[PDB]
Amino acid sequence: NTKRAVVFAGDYAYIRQIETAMKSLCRHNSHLKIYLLNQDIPQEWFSQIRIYLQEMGGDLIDCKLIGSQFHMTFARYFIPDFVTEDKVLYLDSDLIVTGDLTDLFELDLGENYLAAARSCFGAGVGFNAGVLLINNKKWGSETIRQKLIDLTEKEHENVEEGDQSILNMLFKDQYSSLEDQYNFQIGYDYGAATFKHQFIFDIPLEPLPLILHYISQDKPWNQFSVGRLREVWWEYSLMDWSVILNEWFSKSVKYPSKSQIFKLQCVNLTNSWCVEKIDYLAEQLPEVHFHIVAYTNMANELLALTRFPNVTVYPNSLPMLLEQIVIASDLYLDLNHDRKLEDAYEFVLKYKKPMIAFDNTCSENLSEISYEGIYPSSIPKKMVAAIRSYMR
Amino acid sequence: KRAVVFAGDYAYIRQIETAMKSLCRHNSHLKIYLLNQDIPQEWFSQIRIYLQEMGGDLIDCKLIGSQFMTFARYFIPDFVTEDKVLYLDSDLIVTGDLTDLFELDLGENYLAAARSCFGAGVGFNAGVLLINNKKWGSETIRQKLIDLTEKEHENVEEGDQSILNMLFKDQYSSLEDQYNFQIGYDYGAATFKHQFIFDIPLEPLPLILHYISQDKPWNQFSVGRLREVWWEYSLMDWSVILNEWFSKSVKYPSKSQIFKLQCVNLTNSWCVEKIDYLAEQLPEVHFHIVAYTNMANELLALTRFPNVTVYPNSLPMLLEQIVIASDLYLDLNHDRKLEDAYEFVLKYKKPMIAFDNTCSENLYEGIYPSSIPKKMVAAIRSYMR
Numbered sequence: 001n002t003k004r005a006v007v008f009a010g011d012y013a014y015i016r017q018i019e020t021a022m023k024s025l026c027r028h029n030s031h032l033k034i035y036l037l038n039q040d041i042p043q044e045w046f047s048q049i050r051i052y053l054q055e056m057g058g059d060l061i062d063c064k065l066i067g068s069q070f071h072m073t074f075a076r077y078f079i080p081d082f083v084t085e086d087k088v089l090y091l092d093s094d095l096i097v098t099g100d101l102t103d104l105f106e107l108d109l110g111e112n113y114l115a116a117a118r119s120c121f122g123a124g125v126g127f128n129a130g131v132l133l134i135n136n137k138k139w140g141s142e143t144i145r146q147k148l149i150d151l152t153e154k155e156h157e158n159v160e161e162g163d164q165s166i167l168n169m170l171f172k173d174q175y176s177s178l179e180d181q182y183n184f185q186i187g188y189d190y191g192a193a194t195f196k197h198q199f200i201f202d203i204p205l206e207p208l209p210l211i212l213h214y215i216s217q218d219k220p221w222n223q224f225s226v227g228r229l230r231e232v233w234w235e236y237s238l239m240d241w242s243v244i245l246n247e248w249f250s251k252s253v254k255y256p257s258k259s260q261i262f263k264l265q266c267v268n269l270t271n272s273w274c275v276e277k278i279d280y281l282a283e284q285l286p287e288v289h290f291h292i293v294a295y296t297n298m299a300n301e302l303l304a305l306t307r308f309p310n311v312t313v314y315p316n317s318l319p320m321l322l323e324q325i326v327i328a329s330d331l332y333l334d335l336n337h338d339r340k341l342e343d344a345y346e347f348v349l350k351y352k353k354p355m356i357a358f359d360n361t362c363s364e365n366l367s368e369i370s371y372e373g374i375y376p377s378s379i380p381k382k383m384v385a386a387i388r389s390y391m392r
Numbered sequence: 393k394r395a396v397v398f399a400g401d402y403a404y405i406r407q408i409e410t411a412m413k414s415l416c417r418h419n420s421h422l423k424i425y426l427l428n429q430d431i432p433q434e435w436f437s438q439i440r441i442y443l444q445e446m447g448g449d450l451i452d453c454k455l456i457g458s459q460f461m462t463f464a465r466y467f468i469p470d471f472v473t474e475d476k477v478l479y480l481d482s483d484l485i486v487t488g489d490l491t492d493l494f495e496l497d498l499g500e501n502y503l504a505a506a507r508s509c510f511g512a513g514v515g516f517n518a519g520v521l522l523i524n525n526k527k528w529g530s531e532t533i534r535q536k537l538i539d540l541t542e543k544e545h546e547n548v549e550e551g552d553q554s555i556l557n558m559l560f561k562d563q564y565s566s567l568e569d570q571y572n573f574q575i576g577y578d579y580g581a582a583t584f585k586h587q588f589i590f591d592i593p594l595e596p597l598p599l600i601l602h603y604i605s606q607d608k609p610w611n612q613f614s615v616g617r618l619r620e621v622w623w624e625y626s627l628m629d630w631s632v633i634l635n636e637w638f639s640k641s642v643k644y645p646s647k648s649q650i651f652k653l654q655c656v657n658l659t660n661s662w663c664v665e666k667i668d669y670l671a672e673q674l675p676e677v678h679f680h681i682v683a684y685t686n687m688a689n690e691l692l693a694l695t696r697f698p699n700v701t702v703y704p705n706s707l708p709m710l711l712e713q714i715v716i717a718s719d720l721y722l723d724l725n726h727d728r729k730l731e732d733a734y735e736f737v738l739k740y741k742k743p744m745i746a747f748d749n750t751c752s753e754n755l756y757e758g759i760y761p762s763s764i765p766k767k768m769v770a771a772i773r774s775y776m777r
């Protein structure tokens with residue numbers, strides 16, 4: 001069985017909507033490789049949900065939009081910067097999946113950049129951007145991300161529907177059509193009643209369309225709403241993940257969780273952005289939990305480390321808090337480049353913690369043999385091996 | 393049933409539900425009141441089922457009206473009927489059995505509370521309060537808290553907490569630190585250099601963990617300890633909590649029902665005759681109250697009922713679909729009647745009943761005494777099956 005690639009985009013403030021949309025998707029579709037573009041979603045949320053996805057034969061990818069090369073609704077531009085599959089389904093998070101999307105996953109795009117449903121049953125112009133079957137390979141080569149940004153830079157003050165207006169203005173005459181049921185814009189109800197489009201309300205709702213899109217500001221999760229099918233959103237919002245997993249498990253669709261308990265706890269205190277080879281070490285040592293502490297604001301280079309499931313980053317901490325982390329750690333990593341904060345060494349000595357360093361990060365005021373080991377920064381494989389020697 | 397009260401808004405729903413989960417995980421047969429203005433009824437309907445299966449209940453306390461962050465706890469005696477009640481903040485975690493706290497005799501004290509930050513602060517922390525509600529009610533404490541808050545709210549450093557301390561100085565009993573272990577003080581302690589705070593054992597876990605301050609464990613980043621315990625409960629499924637109790641001979645059937653009738657009314661007025669009474673009397677009926685504009689508080693407060701849906705700023709076509717789906721039109725609105733309703737009622741051959749004082753002055757299967765609305769209750773049940 002092969003994985004089907006799906007991408008959502010949203011901030012932590014929208015977590016209840018993102019999670020509800022994912023729950024509805026996973027309820028009816030297994031083997032999903034889900035990418036989630038975000039800036040501020042907590043790592044703990046990703047860790048747990050990732051286990052669910054894996055147990056259902058899929059995975060969950062934390063795509064952190066942290067850095068200058070990068071919300072609101074514009075994050076879908078950066079899709080080909082994260083997704084490795086040649087085809088992927090983008091979904092808004094103000095929507096609900098009600099059934100098997102196999103036919104949608106398997107649609108052949110040909111030379112079309114994407115496939116999409118029309119806007120509001122044909123009331124609007126062009127396609128609705130909330131459901132996009134995307135030719136990711138083509139998006140990569142045609143440099144679509146830069147083209148959307150550049151075009152949105154012009155004429156964002158000249159368009160009625162933002163990113164959607166931009167997507168239609170770039171892509172017209174080169175997209176495939178999806179049936180309305182794959183992006184059924186039930187959120188248009190207020191609009192339809194406004195413009196007196198009586199026949200919109202004669203469109204059958206039994207059985208439920210495969211994808212329900214609650215467009216507009218009349219969201220069913222608000223205290224009050226006026227559009228139809230409000231009850232469907234709540235049905236999935238209030239659904240335990242256990243219900244979803246139990247349905248798949250009861251049909252023998254069960255895969256082992258790939259999560260593992262940590263075998264070692266490492267700590268470093270930095271005041272600078274550059275912790276030597278930290279990204280590489282994190283990548284190579286998923287079974288080590290790294291704790292990177294600072295007493296001040298942190299640069300994007302360090303904040304972006306949240307994309308790893310095994311790095312905890314503590315900006316704006318204080319000496320008493322660092323001390324407790326040191327006591328709890330197995331090994332100090334002297335990897336920071338600027339002037340050393342001595343008391344960390346004091347904590348290290350006091351609590352009898354081993355400490356290792358790179359050739360270019362060892363203190364100028366310390367003797368070599370004060371470290372358990374000093375390893376070459378241009379061959380960090382050697383420190384990887386060094387770190388693993390502390391485990392058992 | 394032990395009475396517990398939380399207070400918070402919909403924006404804080406992730407924290408409220410986590411706190412409740414942690415509470416229910418370790419304590420059964422709880423009557424939970426939740427003071428709020430904007431939490432959706434769907435959330436209440438589902439969580440109420442869980443509380444009932446565990447031998448308790450969930451009460452929606454809607455603070456909707458002129459007489460109404462962080463200051464909702466003043467209104468506790470207006471909603472809570474029990475003589476004693478435990479108020480809890482929503483930025484906290486219950487890690488065990490709270491029986492010794494529930495069973496604490498207050499005597500003549502207005503409340504029991506733990507000291508602020510292990511003694512670092514002044515007076516008590518207001519995030520955990522065992523309240524003598526009978527006394528708060530009889531001595532009109534809510535009014536006094538409001539009045540004291542009118543003055544002095546800008547002379548104080550800790551808001552509602554400072555006011556509660558100011559009113560109840562020398563008239564409260566003490567709780568041990570573990571019933572309000574303010575682990576969220578970690579950043580503060582580290583800031584003011586209170587070194588010995590960090591020597592206090594965290595194992596065994598204190599019965600109540602309180603994440604005070606802006607350093608919340610649910611944020612993307614935080615620096616205080618025990619961050620992982622909050623996430624353990626936030627990510628815990630309700631099925632797990634229910635199974636724990638089911639496994640321990642605690643299991644009751646849900647008191648939920650399905651609606652046997654759908655009724656609808658279109659209104660241009662705040663006054664919909666006897667709608668509060670009808671909703672209360674007919675839980676098996678789902679009432680739909682529609683308006684084309686914003687709605688008065690009298691109508692928005694109907695959200696406290698599990699069987700009334702209110703539709704402010706709706707439109708004729710939207711109303712039409714509701715009317716089509718309805719079994720019976722209730723012409724209960726005072727003042728100007730809107731003809732869209734009569735149009736649809738005619739079109740879709742819908743029955744329509746009224747009170748003797750809400751008939752249109754321009755035209756029913758029945759017209760009932762507005763002074764004995766019980767007759768209408770009997771009549772509404774006559775359309776069912």
Ligand SMILES: O=c1ccn([C@@H]2O[C@H](COP(=O)(O)OP(=O)(O)O)[C@@H](O)[C@H]2O)c(=O)[nH]1
Pocket residue numbers: 008009010011013014072073074091092093094130214215216217
């Ligand atoms: O507060 C917000 C609002 C928007 N979104 C994201 O931006 C998308 C566009 O928002 P919306 O769906 O409301 O636009 P519409 O579908 O009405 O055109 C959403 O699906 C979310 O993924 C978000 O993450 N946080």
Ligand SMILES: O=c1ccn([C@@H]2O[C@H](COP(=O)(O)OP(=O)(O)O)[C@@H](O)[C@H]2O)c(=O)[nH]1
Pocket residue numbers: 399400401403404461462463480481482483519603604605606
């Ligand atoms: O955005 C908010 C902030 C606060 N609260 C409520 O107000 C209480 C007091 O806030 P907090 O607990 O954060 O203050 P502290 O405990 O640090 O004094 C919380 O428990 C919540 O119940 C809320 O409902 N929404």
Ligand SMILES: [Mn+2]
Pocket residue numbers: 092093094095130213214215
């Ligand atoms: Mn959308």
Ligand SMILES: [Mn+2]
Pocket residue numbers: 481482483484519602603604
């Ligand atoms: Mn609190």
